[PDB]
Design a protein around this ligand. Sequence first.
Ligand SMILES: NC(=S)c1ccc(OCC(F)(F)F)nc1
Ligand SMILES: [Cl-]
Ligand SMILES: [Zn+2]
Length: 286
Amino acid sequence: ERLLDELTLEGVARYMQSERCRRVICLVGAGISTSAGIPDFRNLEKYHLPYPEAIFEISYFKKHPEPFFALAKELYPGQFKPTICHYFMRLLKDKGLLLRCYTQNIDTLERIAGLEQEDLVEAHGTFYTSHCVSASCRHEYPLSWMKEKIFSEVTPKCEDCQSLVKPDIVFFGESLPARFFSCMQSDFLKVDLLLVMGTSLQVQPFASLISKAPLSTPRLLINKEKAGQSDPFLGGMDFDSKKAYRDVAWLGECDQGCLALAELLGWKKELEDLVRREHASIDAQS
Ligand SMILES: NC(=S)c1ccc(OCC(F)(F)F)nc1
Ligand SMILES: [Cl-]
Ligand SMILES: [Zn+2]
């Protein structure tokens, strides 16, 4: 009947290494990056905002961009070092198992860890690239350029047309990337396993993704807290009813959950070597 022989991390690992599991979708949130110690970008009383969310609203940003860039200077991380979880997804990619990583995070660490544009759906956008806001220009700028402008407390302007340059975060008043919908429509016909890591599945439409899986597809949650179950008040996760058949919860730090799964898979040495090498490379940036 069920694809998992037991509703445990061991059952998920056995399934992963079976021929039945070829395509894994990761859905990830802030919990996969808390170990990276990046200031959580998403005090303002001094900017006299007409409403708090104005600092992340596109029309306000075009009127008064300075509050946003002052906050971006304040919360700029000391380093962009991905976690064990990010490199676990890079390993999935290397093993030929990663169909897609859908991320709610804007902190760029998926890209730093080696997931390429085709591997990623950055559902809330990213700080990694920025664009001129003029529709007829849209000149793209990389992270180093913006950092130079931001720490100079110079408002970034396009070299071609002098319009504002905005990081590719999805602001209020903007729609989700069209890539989110096109990839969703195709990927969930193809998925054999959902790995849900470091998200509490509370923000829409990202949460609704778990209900797009085929009914047989196992879903592993690696998270500090159980999440994604149907809300007694309001296709949810069923970990614990006697009808549970495919959903597994591993509760702890996301790094430790990924370590435990890698150990079951025989990947712990590969993962350790990857993380140590990449961290050393980032630490050695001269
Ligand atoms: N705390 C986070 S996530 C953070 C803050 C600032 C920042 O600035 C990047 C750029 F310079 F491109 F704007 N990037 C990330
Ligand atoms: Cl969430
Ligand atoms: Zn421009």
